[PDB]
């Protein structure tokens, strides 16, 4: 009943969660997290589920992530300024809140650079954790990765301690040593640094989490070390849709359902996955523009201090760095010509994204026209028999049986005969699919509108 | 009993003691000007500046405020033994605020559609500023030892009636 | 002729000095100014003046300290700070 | 030569000083006061004195930029801004108020002094700041300043002369008195306008302390979610001058940290001949180029070795560049702690957050030989709104609620306290429209951006957006009737003919360039060209034409479907054929699901030219029959390598929710009152993200040679810098297209436009529809 | 030799020289090619007579006639559909609606734009979009629409109304930023700062800017209400004066416009965009189905979009290099013979302890969220009423 | 005037209150014309003047010999923070 007050554009196509192929849950009152997610299910969650079972209500738990439905805004019958649901809608946007470009550092060492809304990440932003081992660049919604974005995860690989027998063995087998490609001063400095670190550590040598036997017990193998990457669609901070998944430059693609890769494509073909990967890459590039805010915590703590940053105070030798038409009268120094050329090309493409792209691609008006005028299923469809075998040469599929015409809306079937004047004359077939029969005697012979077709 | 004799240039007794009745009109300017708060920030600070004075009153019982008007009207506007320079300023400050009150009532009587609108606030900011600066200039005139002849109502309305 | 105009304007001077002696300032200034005046050239002159130049010779003394404590403060601050390696106890334990 | 003259500092100074003549401001009020009393012999003296004072004030204001005493005298913003208003008010109220020499000196001094208050300018002061912009980058500063002042003087003289001559070329006494009348009006208007805006250590605004930068000068919200407040401020930098290398040249930074500079000077005073490098500061530094060249050579050597390793029977994954970690013993898999690792945590060292071994730099600092907490304002704290304000509603309820706040500080509604008309304690009555929602008393309330007064008449508060609330005709008509008929639950048997069916079938396959129209229109005007044979193969393949019964041939190559066990209907169709030789439509519940796939295909084609995945049914049934527990505590063990060695019931229950809603119409007695918790996603940590990202490969593991791109060997963060350093000085084709999707030039622009306007455009993620216009306006229509 | 060594050397040479693939003779030939017909010299009378009889037989088949009539009918339907949507909802937007040319479709016909016809339809679209957007912003329940479902709220609101409203919005906001050529961020700026930059030629209409309530960086021209706020008459006068002076300095005649400022119509811009896309597709076709080269194009790395990290990636070591930079470290090593990295690390730790004692972090990104303000006072009223009820009656 | 007697006490000139009222009305009308009265900006920006001063003297010092110390850094600590936090609203 309370929901009936908040649906007043009167949606004609009746969209529902089944059409999105997603499973939602109500969410017990004593639950704090926004979903089920058996990964993070604690003892209190199990107690709540058991209580709901004992009461006689289905908890709605699954082997995967299950979102919880969000509530409707409350209508206070005292304000004299709301008095309605449209009152609530107009009150919501009267609040003095705006998107803010921020740059924060958190106690655990993570950081975020991008736009926020009501102290929650909204829009484009960059999230970094574990000293760069985890990096996300994409769109956000209510502090959740949602939309298009790219995530990078790295598992560290073995590096030999200088002077050790493991280094000698790895050199003997021909593996690459990173410290061999540095200037001698830097190499000696790094050797002394590693010696100092080893001396400071004493006997406190650690075993990382990705070496635990529980990985072998649960999955049959330990996770492999290298580069992990995903570029596609996100929802509820989980991969959801078509995307591309990479592990050490090995490509996987398909449809993802809340972090789970489905075995079938289910509509996410190679082309659609490539399109969504490109969209995610472009979104990550857009989100990267909010990195290194000159007044953020990150810049003050570690960021560069020599960047110009001033709006309109350019030195005589720095006027070329400015945008606008003023740089057309100042030459680029010889040290920067190629880089400036490539940067100018990229900036021109970015500007043409606004100036020229709308004149080539459909816009929201045309998109709405197409959405209201498209035909999902054709009215008439042809049917035939067999994969057309021919047991004289290997396949050479050659059709011999005449096809038939099916009227998909009404489900009727259309058949034709051969006459002299008008090629083939076609008629209604009273029998049809799923089983209809019993003797042909009389026909219908729907007319031809050739006189009306040609005027 | 006296006064006649009548002075030539008033001393600074009356110059200080005659501009007191300009106190409450000075602090009562913003009562009906909250619609102009969207227009001028200084009207916000003026409220908190006059808050201490309106808090000073109230600790005195209401009979004091209700009897101040009668005491002024029939203790200073009656009989002759008082400077005509001082009773004039008393009657200047005693019903200068009656016009403000009348404007306030005719403002509340009007519907809220035209009060909070773009016309009411523009009218009220001008009214408030003009009234405040009129009060300030009257105070300056009192401190200068001369009358305060505001154009329209002063001469007639406040020289005819206070004759005794 | 300046004397005439000055003796006229002194009347207005006394006028508004008493006027803003008799405003809200007058209501807390019964206590304040009465204490100030009942021993004018007396107790307030000798007690409130000290508090008056307390701020003056105060920031004078802070500027003097800035003169005197700017020599080696950073060195001792760095030395007297614990890290993964260095600590004041280690320094003072062995010369 | 007329070319060197143009390219001169003097000419530029004159040119950009002449432009400032097109401005005006309050500074001309006393210039007009010069002419109000020009009647008489002294009027000429008055006029010349006022003009000379104005010119001298402007000249002193110009000179104060580079002269140290004048710069210190007039470099105080707070003092001048505070003192502006009293001067104006006094000057008004007492302009109302020896011969003439004293008056002449007084008017000259007044005109000189008035120019030093840094008045505002109508319509804006941009033209004045253009002169500063060109001052910054010019070479000879004194010549430029004198040229600009001379140009401004010339323009002022010129426009005064021309206006005067044009006025004397072609009521008058009424205006002469009216200007005297309106000087006071203009002065009063200026006083009101300023009143709406007024509120080398010798700089002393420290005595003021009246500005109170910690107060709220903006009509923003008050963040009181539970109690915490003290939210951080966006601005976290400072103002401090220092000389630093920008790219390879010496530049001055106006936002340098003070502690860094203090430490730099302290350590510089201890060692000689380190900063006396004595080479090109303003020009590029040879050290920069040498470092770049060395890095480039090392990178090239490493890249070439990595590539050469491929040709010796090595897998790509065995030569990929990956972040490494120092290992101490592979037998026990014992590594160094990640905090002490120079590779994983090297940069993050030297930065500590609170929730044999003899240092030699200590010896250098103390000037001592080798042996066998003061803070003078160099600290930086996170700026927060330290003021804790409260609303009027916070202390209105009860005769006994005393934290003793004298002033709330936050305006609220007009609610009252008494309700009774005994036993019940307190409820609230407001019943009015509120224009001061939650504003802070400090803010001016005049620049709110969400609530405005838009119309002449208005009674409530409205958001600005919400407030203003010939022979082809027959077949076309039949097509319209048919398409409208599918909406209803009925079809007319005789409405559709054979021609309509053929038209619908033909409209499936599409063509864009030639078409029957182009081919037949180029069929005429013939015997001059030829027709290519490829289109013949195209027509034969599609059955349009070839070279009996062409209708069947056309209705034979229209993508027939495959083996729906045709027998069922075919056994009825054929005998129907020889024996005649002689209204409700399906619902299609999968329509909405197919719509999204059609949209995706449409998008891809535009840019480039049994209900829930039954695989999950057994999984869900097995889990719901007997749930299993994921041991994530054991899997992520030692993730951080530092192991080393009824009132009360209701109030306490609600503390577990960051946000919640209470709604009106215990178990059923609490079933009449609705509690709606709001759950926030704050569980995003590194551990969960890593587990989710790396679980996919593990789960899906137990169930030109190949288009090699050499730069994929390097790490994503290193390939970019390698290229920058260099620049300083059937499924195979599908996979290749997937890998190189962004290589074509137009793809970036097209994908950016699609991301702007084609996906998630109404779900609260993008503001482009309301903020960004769709088409440009500068092109000629 | 070596199959991969040759590829690596080719990549190095390409990155050193960076050739162009979009202007080869093959691509140009494929651009102005013959999609139909292969006009050539006549191969005697037999070939021309064979083509004549082929054309006669082609124009006699009833299938061809039916296809021609169907194409004509489709063209007529498209024309009438375009005619039925020539006016937008608001009368003041008619010129803007009619000025923009239509986008070609898959069949080569202009794509119609849907026009809102009635007040009820506009209200429905406005309310749907506003409800969905606002509920998404504040974490309430929204309808399960697909990511691709479009709602055209801009036409329902009106373009000029949006321009006016957001001009008013912009006039009360500050704290702007823009990107220079290298991609660094310059600011913060006020409206007066933006005017000053615009008048000097430092900032033009094509400069990418970021404001208060926008989600991504956009050019100044595209933002609603920003051009009227900045480009006043005096700002335009100053910009024109600067351009004139610099043009005279460089010897360019004053009447010659600046680069990128030539007057063009909508049709010319659309033609240029379509031609560029066609050229790219022809480049793709000439090489097969793949883009030529072994080195990814520079624009695919987003060098400009990552300009703010250029200094960070240019120099990167395994030490903080904050209080003791590398050069100062080298000088210290010259002065102090046996200098080890741990001493430098300890000094850096001590200095970072003196300033920012333990501070320079904030709480996680969900601890300062309040939600709609009115809900809190509504909850307070509800709890007061509940306390009244629970005790009495 | 006089209805009981005053010999020479001055009478205030009436044009003052007329001027006050006319100015108030004109200010209201002008504000109606241009509501954004806070957008008016001063002729100079103080930080810009300081930057120009420091730039000129720094260039003059580095032209010959010796380093240059900035006078802005010697300003008392809690005036620089005050300007940094108050300039966008008070001194745009």
Coordinates of N, CA, C and O in Angstrom, one line a residue, chain A residues 384-402, chain D residues 556 560:
Chain A
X384 N 12.4 -23.9 -41.7 CA 12.8 -25.0 -42.6 C 13.1 -26.3 -41.8 O 12.7 -26.4 -40.7
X385 N 13.8 -27.2 -42.4 CA 14.0 -28.5 -41.9 C 15.5 -28.9 -42.0 O 16.1 -28.6 -42.9
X386 N 15.9 -29.6 -40.9 CA 17.3 -30.2 -40.9 C 18.4 -29.2 -40.9 O 18.2 -28.0 -41.2
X387 N 19.6 -29.7 -40.6 CA 20.8 -28.8 -41.0 C 21.2 -29.0 -42.4 O 22.3 -28.7 -42.8
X388 N 20.2 -29.6 -43.2 CA 20.4 -29.8 -44.6 C 21.5 -30.7 -45.0 O 22.5 -30.3 -45.6
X389 N 21.4 -32.0 -44.7 CA 22.5 -32.9 -45.0 C 22.3 -33.3 -46.5 O 21.3 -33.2 -47.1
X390 N 23.5 -33.8 -47.0 CA 23.5 -34.3 -48.4 C 24.6 -35.4 -48.5 O 25.8 -35.1 -48.7
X391 N 24.2 -36.7 -48.3 CA 25.3 -37.7 -48.2 C 25.8 -38.2 -49.6 O 25.8 -39.3 -50.0
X392 N 26.4 -37.2 -50.3 CA 27.2 -37.5 -51.5 C 28.6 -36.8 -51.4 O 29.5 -37.4 -51.9
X393 N 28.7 -35.6 -50.9 CA 29.9 -34.9 -50.6 C 29.9 -34.5 -49.1 O 28.8 -34.5 -48.5
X394 N 31.1 -34.2 -48.5 CA 31.1 -34.1 -47.0 C 30.0 -33.4 -46.4 O 29.3 -34.0 -45.6
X395 N 29.8 -32.1 -46.6 CA 28.6 -31.4 -46.2 C 27.7 -30.9 -47.3 O 26.6 -31.3 -47.6
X396 N 28.3 -29.9 -48.1 CA 27.6 -29.2 -49.2 C 26.1 -29.1 -49.0 O 25.3 -29.5 -49.8
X397 N 25.7 -28.4 -47.9 CA 24.3 -28.3 -47.6 C 23.6 -27.6 -48.7 O 23.8 -26.4 -49.0
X398 N 22.6 -28.3 -49.3 CA 21.8 -27.7 -50.4 C 20.4 -27.9 -50.0 O 19.9 -29.1 -49.8
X399 N 19.6 -26.8 -50.0 CA 18.2 -26.9 -49.5 C 17.3 -27.4 -50.6 O 17.4 -26.9 -51.8
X400 N 16.4 -28.3 -50.3 CA 15.4 -28.8 -51.3 C 14.0 -28.6 -50.8 O 13.1 -28.3 -51.6
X401 N 13.7 -28.7 -49.5 CA 12.4 -28.5 -49.0 C 12.1 -27.0 -48.9 O 12.9 -26.2 -48.5
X402 N 10.9 -26.7 -49.5 CA 10.5 -25.3 -49.5 C 10.2 -24.8 -48.0 O 9.8 -25.6 -47.2
Chain D
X556 N 13.4 -18.2 -50.8 CA 14.2 -19.4 -50.4 C 15.6 -19.0 -49.8 O 16.1 -19.9 -49.1
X560 N 16.2 -19.0 -43.4 CA 15.3 -19.9 -42.8 C 15.9 -20.5 -41.5 O 17.1 -20.6 -41.3

